[PDB]
Design a protein around this ligand. Structure first.
Ligand code: NAD
Ligand code: NAD
Ligand code: UPG
Ligand code: UPG
Ligand code: GAL
Ligand code: GAL
Ligand code: NA
Ligand code: NA
Ligand code: NA
Ligand code: NA
Lengths: 674, 674
C-alpha cells in the first residue's frame, strides 16, 4: 500500500481528501500543528474510513519534528495542504504568513529531497491570478492567465509555486509536482461527519452563513447583480481532484519528472446572492443580509480526466447536514480529552463525555476501555491513571472490551466450518478471554464523539481485526457505540461485528468493568447488596467448563426478602447466570431482544444503586477474588453479559456465538445508576 | 551617533557601504555568517575608517543569535545586503537560495518589528525585471517595468520586495523602506584596500577578468555587436546611493512611513567587449577571450538626489589597484589567525604572519601586542596563550605597546600648554607606563595584513585614544605598522601618532617585549651575552627619576673584549641608556634618523643572536628581576627604545616628547635575529 503524507490533514480540505485517499487504496499519515483544527477530525476519519491514520502534531517549520515522519514511514507521495489562508488577516500579519507558509514548504521539500520522495501535490489558490479582468477575455480564468496576487496570502502561494517550478527545473528527473489552484471550496462530506470547523469567525461566505443559521452569528453581511463572483466547488469534488492529480503523477516514469498546474473549479460563476438563496433553500431558513473569479476547467478535464460532478445545491445540502449534526463543530461542552500514553500520542487518549456533570464517562482507545464512571462526582469503577496500568501483563482485564471471545473455550480448541482451531491456552488448560488476541490490548479507531441532544453524549469506536493477525479465522470489523445519558445517569454499550472476509468466526464480546460503589470509604466491595434475576446458572467442572447442566447458585434474586451481602471475603462468585433457563439460544444479534434487568447492586454507605441490563442470554458474575495487577482481592465486582461458557463447543449453544459471513453480531449492555 | 546594522557587511558591496556610512557620521555594526567572505574585510575597514566596527558572525536565519545584536545595540536602521546571489548556482540549488534569502530576511524583519526598528534599506536587483524586451520601450528599465524574474535568485529578491511592501502596507506608520535595485556593481575602493574577493570562481565578468590578469585563471571566456548588455556601476557610487537612501528615509516623520523602490545604475549600457577593452586598457594587459539590462536612473536622481559620478574606466582602474595590491584577495599563505578571547570574538584575535616559516610573528589586537616571535621554530619572547594572561592586573606589560607615555613621569604630574596635569600614580610615587591609560590594555583597530613581496608580511594596527577617556590632554590617533621579513628574520615596528583635537600631548611609545633566547633549555636568561652601544646612561634618584646627570653603567659595549654575561641572579639592570651623550633631543619624529644598532644579545646554547636597532635617542634595558604575573624573576629581558625618563618634566628633554597639533610623532624599532 502507498503511503501518502498529508500535511494540514486535520483541516478542512485535507480531511476530505484523506477520505478519498483511503477509499482509493492509499494509506495516509497526517502532519498538522493544529493551528486551525483539532485532532477530532482525524479521529472521526479513522472510523469513517475504517483505517488507522497515524498523526503527528508538528509544525512543518520544525525540521527535527517533521523528519520523524520520514524516518517512521516510507512516504510515497505528499499532499501539502498545510498553511495559513485568511486573506484578510494576511494583510495584517504578513510576516507570519510568509514565515509559516514559505518556511513550512521549504523544510518539507528539503526533507523530501533528502528522503528521495519525489511526488508532491500542492494546495495552490486562484488568488495567484489577482484580478484577471486586468486582461481582456480572461474570464473564465485559464492556467495561463498571468499571475499577480494582490494580498500577502496570494503572494505566499505564488512564491511557493515558483519554488516548485524552480526545484523541478533544477533536477527535472527527481520531482513530480502537481500544482492545484483551488477556487472556492464549499460543502461537506455527505455523511455529515466531517466538515469545515472555522476555529474563530468565518471569513468565508459559507461557514459564516451556517454559523448564522445556527445562531452562532447574529446576522450575516452581504459585502452583474451587485455581488462579487466566485466558482464554488464541492469539497468532495475537490478531494477527488487530488486523487486524479496523484494518478497523473503516478503515470510518469520513475526516471521521469514534471511540474504542472491545474485549476480545480466547476467553471460555474456564483452570484453571492445566488448562493445565499441556495443556502436558504438548503437550510430552509432566511438568513439576514476582485470582481470575478471563475475557473476555466478545461485543462484538468482533459489531462487529469477530472471535472466537478456536484452542484452548489449539493454543496449547500451537505454543508447543512454537517451543520445540523454539528452546530458547534467538533468541540463540545461536556467533552474533554487527555493523553494516556506519550505526550502528543493522539490515538492514545482518555476521552471523557458528560464531563463536569453528575454522570461522567471516560473511555480509552486502548481496549475501547471504560476508564472511569463518575456518578455525582464519585468514581464507581476500577481503573488506571494511564495506559501503562492497562497494559500490565498480569491483567485482570479491568474495564476492557473483551473480544473476540469472552470467557472460556475448552482447551482452547474449537472447530468451525469443519476446520479445527487451536487458541493459545492461558488460563488453566483453557483459553480464557481469547488469550493472545484479547481486545483489551488492542487499539481501537476513533472515537467519533457527539452530543446529539441535551444531556446525551455518544462515543463510537471501531476495531479492524484481521485474520492474518490472530488465531481466529476471518477478518472481523467491530464497532462499539457508547451512549451516555446524563439525565438518567446511564451508559449504554452496543456491540456490532461483521466479517469482511472469511466464512465464519466465533464471537462473543463483553465489557469487563469492575465496580466498586463505595470508593470514598472502603478498601473492598464489602457491604454491597446484590440481587440477580435468577439463581439459574451454567454448571461447570473443575476446569470451569460447562458440564451441560444448569444449577442454582446461592444468591438473592429480585424477589428475595433480603439481598446477598458481599463480605470482605465471602461469598465468592465466578459463574455464568442464565437469563431464561428454557431458552434455546439461536441469535447472533440480540439487539432487538428485550433489555432485561439482570443485576441490582446497592451500597448503603454511598447510597448508590447500580442496575445492569442486557439483551444477552447470560451474564458472568465475578467477585474479584483473584484481583491482581495493582488491585487486591474483592476490590471490585464484574458483571459480564454474554453467551454462556464454551458455547462454541456446546452443541446447544454454538450457533449463537457463530458469526457467519453476511450476518451481523449484535449485543447490548446497559448500566444505570440511581 | 546613529547605529546602522549592516547585514552581509563583510561582503563586497556591504563593505564599501560601511566606508560611506562611517564617513557620513554613522556608527556601524556588521552581522555576517561569512558564507561568502572573511572577517579580514571588516578588520581592514576599521583602519580605513578609523572606527571600531562591532562584528557578529551570525546567520540571519538564527533568531537567537541575531537577537543579541538588537539587545546589544540600539539599532537605528538596517541595510540588508546579506544573501546568496549566484544566479547560476541558484538554478541548481534553489532550495538553499529561498531558504537562506527569504528566511534570513523574515527573521531580521521580525526582530526589527519586535525591537521597533523601522528603517530598512534592501539590496534588490535588476534581476527582478526579467527580460524587459518582452515589453516595448522598456529599455532603459524604469522602476515601473513589470517584474518577472527568470531564475531562482531573482525569485527570491522579488519575494522579498513583496514581503516589504506587504509589511509596510500592514502598518504604514511603522516602516520606512528603501528598496534598491542594483544593476552590475564593479570596481573597488580607490585606496585598493578593499574590493571583491570571490571565494571560489568568479561568476562575474569583472572579478573573473581580474583573476585572469593575475594568472588565477587561465583564460576568460566571452559568452548590438554580439555581446549581452549591462549597466556597470562603480561600487563606490553604489555605496553612496545607500547614504542617499538612508537620508531620504530620515527626511520622513517618526510618525510617518513609506515603501519605495529605486534603480541604482549609471544609465549607461556596456558592451561586454567594451568592458574587456576598458579592463585591458586599465590593467595594461590582453586577456584571452537577457539581452539588455540598463537602468533608467531618473527616479533616483530626482528623488534621492543621487546619480553615478564614476566611469567604467574608474571602475576598471580601481579594480585593478585592488587586484595588483591583493592578487589573491584577503587570504594569504603564511598568515593565520585564532581567537584570543571568546569564540567568535573577531576583534580579539592573535594573527600570525610569516606563519610556517623560519620567522613567525604573532600579534594581538589587545595592546597591539607582540604575542610571539619564533626564529627557526623556536619562540624567543615571553607571552601568554590568550588575552586572559595579558589582562592580569599584576601586569609586567609583556609584549605590549606602551603608551601614551613609556616609563616614569615624576609624581605623575606634568604641565603642558601652561596647564597642569595629574596622572594616576601606580609605581612608587610616580606614574609609570601611563598607568591607567596604558595601551597594553587597550584594544586596537585592524589589523590590515599584507604580503607585499616575497618573504615580506605587514600588519598594521590603529588606536583611537580620546581625551575624554584618558587623563592626558587631546584626541590622539596612533598607528602601528609591523613589518616581518622572513628572509632577514627581522621585525620592524613603526609608530606614528597625531592629535586630531587638542593643542598638545606628551607622547613616548615603545614595545615591551621580553626576550628569552634559550626557551627550549632553561628556566632563566642566565647565559645570555649582552653588549650595548655605550655605557652612558640616565642617572636616576631613589625614585627612578633623573638627577639631571649622565653616568656610565657597568656593562659591555660593542668594543669590549668580553660581553656582559647575565647570570641567574646578577647583574641586574633597569636603566635608560643614551645613544649619543651629546645630543640635544629635539625631534618628535625620528623616522628619518639613522637606524642605530643599540643592543646585541646572544645565547651560546641556542646559538641565537638578537640585535635591536632604533631611530630613538635612548633605550631602557631591564633584566626582568621584578617579573610577575605568571613569570618569575629574570625569565626574560626587555629593551625599550624611546625618550629618556620623565622627559616631559625635563627642561632639556621635554620638547622631544611633546606632540603638538599639526605634527606627527614617529618612532622606529627593529629586532633582527641571526
Ligand atoms: N478553503 C479555501 O477556500 C482555500 C482556497 C484555495 C487554496 N486553499 C488552501 O488549501 C489548503 C487547505 O485549506 P483549508 O481550507 O483546508 O484550511 P485549513 O485551515 O482547514 O487547513 C490547513 C491546515 O494546516 C495546518 N497548518 C497550518 N500551518 C501549519 C504548519 N506550519 N505545520 C503544520 N500544519 C499546519 C492547520 O492547522 C490546518 O489544519 C491551504 O494551503 C489553503 O491555503 C484553501
Ligand atoms: N554583486 C552584484 O552584482 C549584485 C547585484 C545586485 C544585487 N546584489 C545583492 O547585493 C547584496 C550584496 O551582494 P554582494 O556582491 O556584496 O555579495 P557578497 O557575497 O559579497 O555579500 C553578501 C554577504 O552576505 C553574507 N551572508 C549570506 N547569507 C547570510 C546569512 N544567512 N546571514 C548572514 N550573512 C549572510 C555573505 O557571507 C556575504 O558576506 C546581496 O543581497 C546581493 O544579492 C548584488
Ligand atoms: O462574510 C462574508 C464573506 C464573503 N461574502 C461575499 O460572498 C463571496 C464569498 O467570499 P469568500 O467566501 O470569502 O470567497 P473569496 O473571497 O472569493 O476567497 C476564497 O477563494 C479564493 C479563490 O477565489 C481561495 O483561493 C481563497 O483561499 C478563499 O479565501 C464574495 O462575493 C464575498 O464578497 C459575504 O457576503 N460575506
Ligand atoms: O564569465 C563570464 C561572465 C559574464 N560574461 C559576460 O559579460 C557580461 C557580464 O555578466 P555578469 O558579470 O555575470 O553580469 P550579469 O549576468 O548581467 O548579472 C549581474 O547583474 C544583475 C543585474 O543585471 C545583478 O542584479 C546580479 O546580482 C548579477 O549577477 C554579460 O554580457 C556576460 O554575458 C562573460 O563574458 N564571462
Ligand atoms: O480476571 C478475569 C476474570 O474474568 C471472569 O470473566 C472469569 O470468569 C474469571 O474466572 C476471571 O478470568
Ligand atoms: O615591568 C615593567 C618594567 O618596565 C621597565 O620599563 C621599567 O623601567 C621597570 O622599572 C619596570 O616598570
Ligand atoms: Na454532532
Ligand atoms: Na470540550
Ligand atoms: Na596586499
Ligand atoms: Na592564510
Amino acid at each position: 500500500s502507498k503511503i501518502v503524507l498529508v500535511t494540514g490533514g486535520a483541516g478542512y480540505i485535507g480531511s476530505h481528501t484523506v477520505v478519498e485517499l483511503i477509499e482509493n487504496g492509499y494509506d495516509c499519515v497526517v502532519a498538522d500543528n493544529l493551528s486551525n483544527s483539532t485532532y477530532d477530525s482525524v479521529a472521526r476519519l479513522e472510523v469513517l474510513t475504517k483505517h488507522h491514520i497515524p498523526f503527528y502534531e508538528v509544525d512543518l517549520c520544525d525540521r527535527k519534528g517533521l523528519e520523524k515522519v520520514f524516518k517512521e514511514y516510507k512516504i510515497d507521495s505528499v499532499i501539502h495542504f498545510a498553511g495559513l489562508k485568511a486573506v484578510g488577516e494576511s494583510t495584517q500579519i504578513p510576516l507570519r504568513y510568509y514565515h509559516n507558509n514559505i518556511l513550512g514548504t521549504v523544510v518539507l521539500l528539503e526533507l523530501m529531497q533528502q528522503y528521495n520522495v519525489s511526488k508532491f501535490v500542492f494546495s495552490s489558490s486562484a488568488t495567484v491570478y489577482g484580478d484577471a479582468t486586468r486582461f481582456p477575455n480572461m474570464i473564465p480564468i485559464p492556467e495561463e492567465c498571468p499571475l499577480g496576487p494582490t494580498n500577502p496570502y496570494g503572494h505566499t502561494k505564488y512564491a511557493i509555486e515558483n519554488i516548485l517550478n524552480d526545484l523541478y527545473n533544477s533536477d527535472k528527473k527527481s520531482w513530480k509536482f502537481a500544482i492545484l489552484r483551488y477556487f472556492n471550496p464549499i460543502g461537506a462530506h455527505p455523511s455529515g461527519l466531517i466538515g469545515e470547523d472555522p476555529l474563530g469567525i468565518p471569513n468565508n461566505l459559507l461557514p459564516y452563513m451556517a454559523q448564522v443559521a445556527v445562531g452562532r452569528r447574529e446576522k450575516l453581511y452581504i459585502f452583474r447583480d451587485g455581488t462579487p463572483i466566485r466558482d464554488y466547488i464541492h469539497v468532495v469534488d475537490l478531494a477527488k481532484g487530488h486523487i486524479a492529480a496523484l494518478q497523473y503523477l503516478e503515470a510518469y516514469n520513475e526516471n521521469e519528472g514534471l511540474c504542472r498546474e491545474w485549476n480545480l473549479g466547476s467553471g460555474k460563476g456564483s452570484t453571492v446572492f445566488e448562493v445565499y438563496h441556495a443556502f436558504c433553500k438548503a437550510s430552509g431558513i432566511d438568513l439576514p443580509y476582485v470582481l470575478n473569479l471563475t475557473a476555466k476547467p478545461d485543462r484538468a478535464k482533459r489531462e487529469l480526466k477530472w471535472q466537478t460532478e456536484l452542484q452548489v445545491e449539493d454543496s449547500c445540502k451537505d454543508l447543512w447536514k454537517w451543520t445540523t449534526e454539528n452546530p458547534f463543530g467538533y468541540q463540545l461542552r461536556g467533552v474533554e480529552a487527555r493523553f494516556s500514553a506519550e505526550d502528543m500520542r493522539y490515538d492514545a487518549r482518555f476521552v471523557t463525555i458528560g464531563a463536569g456533570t453528575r454522570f461522567q464517562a471516560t473511555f480509552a482507545n486502548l481496549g475501547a476501555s471504560i476508564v472511569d464512571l463518575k456518578v455525582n462526582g464519585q468514581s464507581v469503577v476500577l481503573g488506571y491513571e494511564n495506559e501503562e496500568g492497562y497494559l500490565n501483563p498480569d491483567s485482570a482485564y479491568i474495564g476492557a472490551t473483551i473480544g473476540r471471545y469472552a470467557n472460556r473455550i475448552s482447551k482452547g480448541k474449537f472447530s468451525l466450518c469443519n476446520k479445527d482451531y487451536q487458541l493459545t491456552v492461558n488460563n488453566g488448560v483453557n483459553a480464557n478471554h481469547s488469550s493472545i488476541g484479547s481486545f483489551h490490548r488492542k487499539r481501537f479507531l476513533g472515537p467519533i464523539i457527539q452530543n446529539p441532544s441535551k444531556d446525551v453524549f455518544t462515543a463510537e469506536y471501531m476495531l479492524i481485526d484481521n485474520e492474518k493477525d490472530t488465531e481466529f479465522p476471518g477478518d472481523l470489523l467491530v464497532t462499539i457505540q457508547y451512549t451516555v445519558n446524563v439525565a438518567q445517569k446511564s451508559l449504554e454499550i452496543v456491540y456490532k461485528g461483521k466479517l469482511t472476509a472469511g466464512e465464519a468466526t466465533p464471537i462473543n464480546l463483553t465489557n469487563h468493568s469492575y465496580f466498586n460503589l463505595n470508593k470514598p470509604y472502603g478498601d473492598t466491595i464489602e457491604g454491597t447488596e446484590i440481587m440477580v434475576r435468577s439463581k439459574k446458572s451454567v454448571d461447570v467442572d473443575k476446569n470451569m467448563i460447562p458440564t451441560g447442566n444448569i444449577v442454582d447458585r446461592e444468591i438473592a434474586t429480585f424477589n428475595s426478602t433480603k439481598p446477598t451481602v458481599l463480605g470482605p471475603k465471602n461469598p465468592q462468585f465466578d459463574c455464568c447466570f442464565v437469563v431464561d433457563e428454557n431458552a434455546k439460544p439461536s441469535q447472533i444479534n440480540t439487539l432487538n431482544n428485550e433489555l432485561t434487568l439482570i443485576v441490582k447492586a446497592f451500597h448503603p454507605d454511598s447510597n448508590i444503586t447500580l442496575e445492569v441490563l442486557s439483551t444477552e442470554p447470560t451474564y458472568q458474575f465475578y467477585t474479584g477474588d483473584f484481583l491482581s495487577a495493582g488491585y487486591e482481592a474483592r476490590q471490585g465486582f464484574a458483571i459480564e453479559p454474554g453467551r454462556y461458557i464454551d458455547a462454541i463447543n456446546q452443541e446447544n449453544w454454538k450457533d449463537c456465538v457463530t458469526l457467519k459471513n453476511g450476518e451481523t453480531y449484535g449485543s447490548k449492555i446497559v448500566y444505570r445508576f440511581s
